[PDB]
Amino acid sequence: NAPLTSIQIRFIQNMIQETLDDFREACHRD
Amino acid sequence: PLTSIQIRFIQNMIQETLDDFREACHRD
Amino acid sequence: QKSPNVLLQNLCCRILGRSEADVAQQFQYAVRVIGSNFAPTVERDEFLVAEKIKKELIRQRREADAALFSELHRKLHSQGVLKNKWSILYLLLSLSEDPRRQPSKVSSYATLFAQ
Amino acid sequence: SPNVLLQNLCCRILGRSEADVAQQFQYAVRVIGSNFAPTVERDEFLVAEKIKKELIRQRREADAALFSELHRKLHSQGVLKNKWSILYLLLSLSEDPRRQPSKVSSYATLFAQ
Amino acid sequence: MATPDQKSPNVLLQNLCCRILGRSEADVAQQFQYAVRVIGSNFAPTVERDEFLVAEKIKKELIRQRREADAALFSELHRKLHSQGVLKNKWSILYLLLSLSEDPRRQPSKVSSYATLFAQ
Amino acid sequence: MATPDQKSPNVLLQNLCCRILGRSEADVAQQFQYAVRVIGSNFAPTVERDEFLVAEKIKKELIRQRREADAALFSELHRKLHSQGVLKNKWSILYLLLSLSEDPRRQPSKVSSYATLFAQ
Amino acid sequence: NLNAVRETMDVLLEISRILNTGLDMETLSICVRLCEQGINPEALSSVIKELRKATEALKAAENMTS
Amino acid sequence: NLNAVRETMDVLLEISRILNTGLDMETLSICVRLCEQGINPEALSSVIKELRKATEALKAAENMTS
């Protein structure tokens, strides 16, 4: 059960944030 | 497996990003 | 207890600095907006709205504004005068402006529709 | 006046006189007059990075470099007061050459009359 | 060489409304007006403008409906269509076909008769 | 084709307006018109058209509201209803009931009297 | 109660000033009273935004006509 | 300053050409002037899209009438 490194957690968070921002931006643009 | 601290951090970050996206859509 | 409509009209007149006759189109727009069904506000929880305002101010490197917001929220919670704290917190968060970002001077182009 | 400039811009883009672009001018005025939610990014560097990523995504690395150079030149020229807004607009108006343009159906011409 | 009189999209849309309603074009005037209003409206770009990406999305959707055989058939038909080269706008037609697919497994939420009140 | 003497949708909407407002149908005419407009408005497809999925969503919502006993009761009632087979549109009714479920802990946002100001 | 209301209004004024909201004491008091009386915060925010937009449109018209 | 404005406009035109934006030098200069005056980029993008649709309809009408 290798704990997710702080760097990996930050990377996953940034990826999720980017995808959610893209979805919000697409909805806003629409 | 994501440590409980890492899991909690990732969960909070994902929740914040989804809340921000919902808020932006709602504001628009 | 001035009716909310009269209070909103007085507020518009005070904020714009114009007579009711000069704000007739704006008064009609305001009445239409207030009477129009609006999507729910981004945050309807007083504590969640306060936390979101604090987080947004901290993320913008506006520590002074974040401290002021936290102090105002503490004061509002302790005073206990307001029944709907969430509405006031949501309004304040929605109306917050970054003091560092130079007010986007409204392009003269808006005047075309004013006539 | 900015309004006259916008009308002239519409006329230039459409290739018609200002009197012939009245409906398009009205549409533009309506769009500008609508209350918009705050922009996602008001930072010139963030807008530039988003534009660069969008240009790279279309496999236009040369066009991405050209865009970065043009942005650098604009920043050094110092003519624009709101660099973030212009960069965001340019990013928003970029089109991917690989995605086949959804050809506006001849049917749109049917209602113009 | 007088390319068969493919009546202009307005006439084609009127004929389509008449055909869909099973009434003459004159009897579909309200439906024709609704169609004209829809067609004159600015439409968002199709979800996928890549022929292969649209075909893959169609195959995935068929698999999601537990129509794996239909998903394979869709992928094969898409390959055949791409090889045939008859359609000029493959992405638009693929997006349309994807948009028109119906899940046989999802029990039709029977449109309440009340919707007819607004059709007039 | 067993069409129950279903009093017309207009009568049902008028009765609903009168019941909701606590005014007579004649006094709920604006509310009746609003109801007719809402029903006539195009609505997005319901979130769930599966009877069991709607029941599970209702149970999950009750659990999220810390109403675990109410979630179990909802699941049991849904199982009983499915076995009973009395409801013709189980998915629609279940989805409606789930959407209409209220958390007793979340204070009903009393529609401000202020909405009446714009009616004049 | 009066002292508590005054303290709340002062806190709100300070928050508005730090946030550069442009609200005066009377408008802030009216908004606070409406929110305390149950007014939907979205309606109040839309009204405030419309009044600010009207002031900005009037200022733009005065600057274009000058 | 004039040379700097000319260089910026040339750079912008080159960027538009490489990106296939369809903007000319005059339109690019107008957009730059509008942006310098503070116009919201989202509103500007929506206005640009509507203007482009109108321009395409006008070009189709001109090609049909010619």
As a whole number of angstroms, the distance between CA H2 and CA H8 comes to: 10
Determine E/C contact with 3+ CB pairs under 8 A as the test. Answer: no
Show Cβ contacts of residue E119 under 8 Å, excluding neighbours closer than 6 positions: E30, E31
Nearest to G59 by CA among G32, G22, G30: G22
Cβ contact, residue pair G39, F112, below 8 Å: yes
As a whole number of angstroms, the distance between CA E40 and CA D109 comes to: 9
Cβ contact, residue pair G49, D1, below 8 Å: no
Method for this entry: cryo-EM
Chain F hits for E117, Cβ within 8 Å: 9, 36, 40
Dihedral, F20, F21, F23, F26 alpha carbons, nearest 10: -90
Chain G hits for F114, Cβ within 8 Å: 38-40, 43
Residue labelled with tokens 């000058």 = G66
Burial of C72 (0-12, 13-18, 19+ CB in 10 A): buried
End-to-end CA distance of chain A: 43
Chain D hits for B27, Cβ within 8 Å: 37-38
What are D70's two structure tokens?
Answer: 């043009």
Using DSSP, how many helices (H) and how many strands (E) does chain C show? Answer: 6, 0
Using DSSP, how many helices (H) and how many strands (E) does chain D show? Answer: 6, 0
As a whole number of angstroms, the distance between CA G46 and CA C91 comes to: 10
What are D82's two structure tokens?
Answer: 């709101």
Show Cβ contacts of residue C91 under 8 Å, excluding neighbours closer than 6 positions: G31, G35, G41, G44, G45, G48
Cβ contact, residue pair C109, H38, below 8 Å: no
Cβ contact, residue pair D107, E9, below 8 Å: yes
As a whole number of angstroms, the distance between CA D46 and CA C103 comes to: 19
Using DSSP, how many helices (H) and how many strands (E) does chain B show? Answer: 1, 0
CA distance B8 to chain D (A): 27
Nearest to E10 by CA among D111, D104, H60: D111
As a whole number of angstroms, the distance between CA F57 and CA D104 comes to: 42
What are C39's two structure tokens?
Answer: 């999507």
Residue labelled with tokens 């529709």 = C113
CB atoms under 10 Å from CB of F55, counted, come to 25
Nearest to F28 by CA among F13, F12, F17, F15: F17
CB atoms under 10 Å from CB of D24, counted, come to 25
Strand spans (E) along F1-120 = none
What are H's interface residues with C at a Cβ cutoff of 8 A? 34, 37-40
Chain B hits for A26, Cβ within 8 Å: none
As a whole number of angstroms, the distance between CA H45 and CA D13 comes to: 15
Residue D37's identity, in one-letter code, is: A
Residue labelled with tokens 């003497």 = F5
CA distance G10 to chain C (A): 9
As a whole number of angstroms, the distance between CA E41 and CA D65 comes to: 37
Helix axes D2-14, H41-65, angle to 10 degrees: 40
As a whole number of angstroms, the distance between CA G18 and CA C97 comes to: 9
For residues G53 and G47, the answer to whether their CB atoms sit within 8 Å is no
Show Cβ contacts of residue H59 under 8 Å, excluding neighbours closer than 6 positions: D14, D15
Show Cβ contacts of residue B22 under 8 Å, excluding neighbours closer than 6 positions: A24, C42
Chain D hits for A30, Cβ within 8 Å: none
- Cite the DSSP H helix spans in E22-115: 29-40, 51-64, 68-84, 90-100
What are F37's two structure tokens?
Answer: 């407009």
As a whole number of angstroms, the distance between CA F94 and CA F107 comes to: 24
- Which of C3, C35, C44 shows the shortest C-beta gap to F118? C35
For residues A9 and B6, the answer to whether their CB atoms sit within 8 Å is yes
Residue G1: strand, helix, or coil: coil
Q: Residue C96 has what DSSP assignment? A: -
Cβ contact, residue pair A25, D37, below 8 Å: no
Nearest to C87 by CA among E76, G36, G19: G36
Question: Which chains form contacts with chain H, at 3 or more CB pairs under 8 Å?
Answer: C, D
Helix axes C85-95, G25-36, angle to 10 degrees: 140
Chain G hits for F110, Cβ within 8 Å: 38
